Design an enzyme around this catalytic site. Sequence first.
Site, short mmCIF file in Angstrom:
data_model
loop_
_atom_site.label_atom_id
_atom_site.label_comp_id
_atom_site.label_asym_id
_atom_site.label_seq_id
_atom_site.Cartn_x
_atom_site.Cartn_y
_atom_site.Cartn_z
N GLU A 13 46.19 57.45 -74.28
CA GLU A 13 47.44 57.27 -74.97
C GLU A 13 48.55 57.96 -74.18
OE1 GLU A 13 46.49 59.90 -78.57
OE2 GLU A 13 48.68 60.00 -78.41
N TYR A 14 49.72 57.34 -74.20
CA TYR A 14 50.91 57.84 -73.52
C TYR A 14 51.67 58.89 -74.34
CZ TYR A 14 55.79 57.67 -71.86
OH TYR A 14 57.06 57.98 -71.43
N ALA A 15 52.02 60.01 -73.71
CA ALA A 15 52.77 61.08 -74.37
C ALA A 15 54.20 60.97 -73.83
CB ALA A 15 52.18 62.46 -74.03
N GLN A 45 45.61 60.50 -60.12
CA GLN A 45 46.80 59.66 -60.22
C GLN A 45 46.91 59.00 -61.60
OE1 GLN A 45 47.04 55.83 -57.93
NE2 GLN A 45 48.82 56.77 -56.93
N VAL A 46 48.05 59.20 -62.25
CA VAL A 46 48.30 58.62 -63.57
C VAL A 46 49.55 57.75 -63.52
CG1 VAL A 46 48.72 59.05 -66.00
CG2 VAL A 46 47.36 60.66 -64.66
N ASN A 81 54.33 67.17 -69.96
CA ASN A 81 53.50 68.35 -70.18
C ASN A 81 54.30 69.52 -70.74
OD1 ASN A 81 54.13 70.50 -68.02
ND2 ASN A 81 53.86 68.67 -66.77
N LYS A 84 44.69 56.60 -65.88
CA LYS A 84 44.25 57.53 -64.86
C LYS A 84 43.35 56.75 -63.92
CE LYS A 84 42.94 62.21 -63.92
NZ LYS A 84 43.34 63.61 -64.24
N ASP A 92 43.89 66.35 -70.14
CA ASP A 92 43.11 66.55 -68.93
C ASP A 92 41.74 67.18 -69.13
OD1 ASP A 92 42.50 66.38 -66.27
OD2 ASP A 92 43.78 68.05 -65.63
N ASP A 127 39.83 74.17 -68.85
CA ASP A 127 41.05 74.15 -68.05
C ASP A 127 42.25 74.08 -68.98
OD1 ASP A 127 42.42 72.03 -65.35
OD2 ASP A 127 42.64 74.18 -65.78
N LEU A 144 53.35 58.45 -63.37
CA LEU A 144 53.85 59.53 -64.21
C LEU A 144 53.69 60.89 -63.53
CD1 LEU A 144 52.23 58.31 -67.54
CD2 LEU A 144 54.46 57.73 -66.59
N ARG A 148 50.28 73.38 -68.66
CA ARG A 148 50.40 72.21 -67.79
C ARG A 148 49.46 71.11 -68.26
NH1 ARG A 148 47.72 75.91 -64.80
NH2 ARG A 148 45.45 75.65 -64.81
N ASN A 149 48.46 71.47 -69.06
CA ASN A 149 47.49 70.49 -69.55
C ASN A 149 47.63 70.08 -71.02
OD1 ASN A 149 44.68 71.30 -67.34
ND2 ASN A 149 46.43 69.91 -67.11
#
Lengths: 288, 285, 286, 283
Positions: free
Chosen positions: B98-100, B27-28, B104, B50, B170, B152, B26, B156-157
């Site tokens: 869980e998958y989004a 390391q992920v 982002n 991840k 993240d 953070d 998508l 982006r997160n």
Amino acid sequence: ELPEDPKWEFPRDKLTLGKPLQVVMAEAVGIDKDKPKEAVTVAVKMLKDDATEKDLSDLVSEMEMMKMIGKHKNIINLLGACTQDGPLYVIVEYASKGNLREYLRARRPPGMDINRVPEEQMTFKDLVSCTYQLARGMEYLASQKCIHRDLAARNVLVTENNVMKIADFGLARDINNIDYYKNTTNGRLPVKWMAPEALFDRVYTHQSDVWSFGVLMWEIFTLGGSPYPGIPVEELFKLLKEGHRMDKPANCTNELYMMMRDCWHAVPSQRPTFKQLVEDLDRILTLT
Amino acid sequence: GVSEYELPEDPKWEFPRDKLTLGKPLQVVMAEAVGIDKDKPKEAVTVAVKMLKDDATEKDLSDLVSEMEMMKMIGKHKNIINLLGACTQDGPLYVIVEYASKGNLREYLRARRPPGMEVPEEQMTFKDLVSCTYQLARGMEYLASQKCIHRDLAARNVLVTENNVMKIADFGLARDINNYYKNGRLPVKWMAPEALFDRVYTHQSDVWSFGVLMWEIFTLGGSPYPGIPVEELFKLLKEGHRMDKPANCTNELYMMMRDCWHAVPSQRPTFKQLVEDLDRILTLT
Amino acid sequence: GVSEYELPEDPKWEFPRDKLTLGKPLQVVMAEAVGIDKDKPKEAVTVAVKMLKDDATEKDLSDLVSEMEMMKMIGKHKNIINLLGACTQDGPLYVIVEYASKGNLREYLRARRPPGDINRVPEEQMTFKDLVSCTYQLARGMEYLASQKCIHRDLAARNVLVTENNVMKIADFGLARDINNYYKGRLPVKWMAPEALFDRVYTHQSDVWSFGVLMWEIFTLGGSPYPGIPVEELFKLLKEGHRMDKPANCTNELYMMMRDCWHAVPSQRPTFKQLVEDLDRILTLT
Amino acid sequence: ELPEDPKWEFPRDKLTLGKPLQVVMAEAVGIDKDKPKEAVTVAVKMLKDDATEKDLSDLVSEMEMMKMIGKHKNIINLLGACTQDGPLYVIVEYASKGNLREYLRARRPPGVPEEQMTFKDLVSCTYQLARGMEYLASQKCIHRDLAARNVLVTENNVMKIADFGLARDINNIDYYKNTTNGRLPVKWMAPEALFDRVYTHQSDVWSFGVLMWEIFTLGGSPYPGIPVEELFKLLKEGHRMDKPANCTNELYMMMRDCWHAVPSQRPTFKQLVEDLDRILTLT
Ligand SMILES: Nc1ncnc2c1ncn2[C@@H]1O[C@H](COP(=O)(O)OP(=O)(O)CP(=O)(O)O)[C@@H](O)[C@H]1O
């Protein structure tokens, strides 16, 4: 926050930034007093918009280390920097063929993965020459009492005539007047290239670089293969404690493999020095 | 630490490797976990995994473990990406989250900028953006109540899923501060003054970050402090420099941003206050 | 023809260039059209724009022209992409059409297949009923098309767009033809009816065969027709009576509908009117 | 169907398809009879799953044209083909640097990038291409689709003319007759072809002129800011592209000669080669 250093300072108005290769290609007018009016292509290292405090200090330290290391044919050379009034730009020599890992994978022989350059398939002699040049670069580095700590195919650049240039001195350290460098507990050094003393004892010497050189040799002769294939880093720790070592790359002389194994001797002082590596490689190259 | 180190066994979170099929990165990487939901034992569910890369450093492993542990003690909430399990025993470390479905927030927003701004996607309404902000505030309020600092927080997160649902993600740099948190690895442009100048981090540091996040949201994924290098930001913040108001942003919301950027942490609002204000602004919108 | 040729004025459909702002490609690009809806003169509405590329050929231009003209002639309908306007005078030809925020059907279906190939939308996983509904909406779109004496000739999941509200909208009339008073090869082979080639004829019954292939794509959630069989071998196979297997989890009732569509003889295939009726019943029962 | 041609037929089991560059990269063992067990990287052209009848007829035609052009250092050469029992595969020489258009856009000056073209390099590119066309014309073949996007660059900056999908053989005929609305990119089309539907080697010379302009603009797009639909009229009114910045007046005049309204008044590829060779030397 960064005091000027007239010796390396380069005027921003004489620098035109290009597209990234964060490192971006650029044109520097007369970054070589010899040719005042001559524009030359160079590589510029700078911070990303989302840079951390550590990224800034890493870029500074990297710039300063290159100043002290000196110039050598097999080392990417620093050409200057823009450190005043404005973003920090570390200007280094541009290497047209990119990193060694990609360089090798691109010219692998057919039979047995992206762009390819068959007119440049690697001969065995080419590989040995690559290794010899790199041993030469490290020998010079060590003589300057500097440890690289992050030696790997991805950190070697290839220029025009298949000239190897050691690069990426972000983690390099100066050990002049000290017996060894002391790593932090959980470092930022790729584990698969890390000597055992560094990994388990947090100690780092030139001989630790020699270990890394061994892994690099394996990368070269596998034409860009990834070390300890199929072995996740989390499982490598134990295996190394139990003396695990990578086997011989297909199409590699036993002599060169033994050289790698010498580089991976558990005892640092029992591994060859870069001086001996250069001497032996020169002979092997001469023969072939 | 990491090298001569061994991850213990945690029953309630462990998930069998033979039940996980790694997919495309998508390391992920995307993946399918059968029975991750013990109530649907035969159900293959899509999730995100991840893991470490081949060139991983000791600190990378250390950070992944920490990230996983932080998520275990944060508890569920609709505006936070939650942990589904992990493969820690015998094999590489896998942190199943869980998958989004929508990626982002930063890119989600840039994709729907107006034609002639700075694959495209339908523009966003002001209500949508206010809603995003609200949810994020709600997510952070819960995070602070769990005495956790993210550190953070940035567009982006944040992950986007379902019907414009915001999920804070993240937690690689997140810290538990139960019973503050003393060269930082935090993006400078999102950092509160005291984070560096005082080496301290509290929920009020996260509120400053939230302000920058708001700015990203209302500039539809713009880069903070545009044109200003990180090395010069230090000085500027000191002189009281602050970002201009995003075009088409109500003064009321911009003042919220400025409150978040108060030099003194104790003078910035709390996520509870932000949630309340935002809840009203959203209703009135 | 295209070179020494000039587009006539059509005030009814013409749209002012100064009120259209081009965006990035979805060549079809997203764009904002202010007042495209003469009832909301001040409203800027998101639309899609089809235009030529820098390396366009003469044929690309004539094809774009006819595509535009076909849409003018077909008339409105809920399951057909809507033509909103055009910039034909003084400048590049811009065919403005309805923007479908969910993309083409093939990718839509692939993104929401159930677990066990890019982005996934599990929260919108396709149910058996959704697939039936899609097949039905498309039947209605084509029935309307036939009633207007217009053959599409390029029906396929990639040529179907789905709105934000999951409405199926027939699209890409680049190869569409008007046969008002058949049409005697630029058609994708795997979607082509036998007589289309072997007889160089095209009728609504040719479109029905294509519809069958579309059904198969729908029920395989965006699968590629005749998988493993190259286009060059398809010719022979269809002749021997070869037909695609039933999609997994597809009712035999719907698969028979597919086979009826793939009758070698055009006159033996159902009409879109019949498909609409049958599908309407099947949907209700589902 | 498709009758076999043993001369070019290559066994499918000796070919391993690879990642795509539709055209895919591949490995063909012994594609060179002189190299029995020697595997060699090549490029394989094939049909897409949604191919039309015309796509197939074009792929066949492309292959046959290449089978008759012969070999030349500046033309991508045909190596073989799999035409029996299976999908059609046209096996051709692999170019390691991709197409000229992108090859050049990446070589643009600052202000993935690549070093940089010297003026001499550009002139050499042009000369090599004139040589390829001169050979093509001598073979009585018109390309019809000459453009930077259809030029491949290999190893040592060697130009190879490619994409013979629209190429035609005009041996024993005075000119080729285009269809009314052809499939030739208009911005590279000579006026006779565009308005009169006639095509000769001199029409290819016109395209060569546009190609020159592409080269010296380092991959620029012809007739910038001018939509195809407006180009028709402009060409009837004698419109011509201006000199590319950083281009000698001599080379620009060569381009203009190539765009002479009168075909026979344009230089031949033989004259272009001769002139370019001189210019290259003085460079
Ligand atoms: N009105 C519209 N609204 C939204 N998306 C649209 C659209 N018209 C086209 N698209 C999407 O944009 C994509 C790109 O446009 P384009 O028309 O160039 O593709 P295409 O139909 O020629 C390719 P193919 O059908 O082979 O995938 C289409 O494949 C479709 O997914």
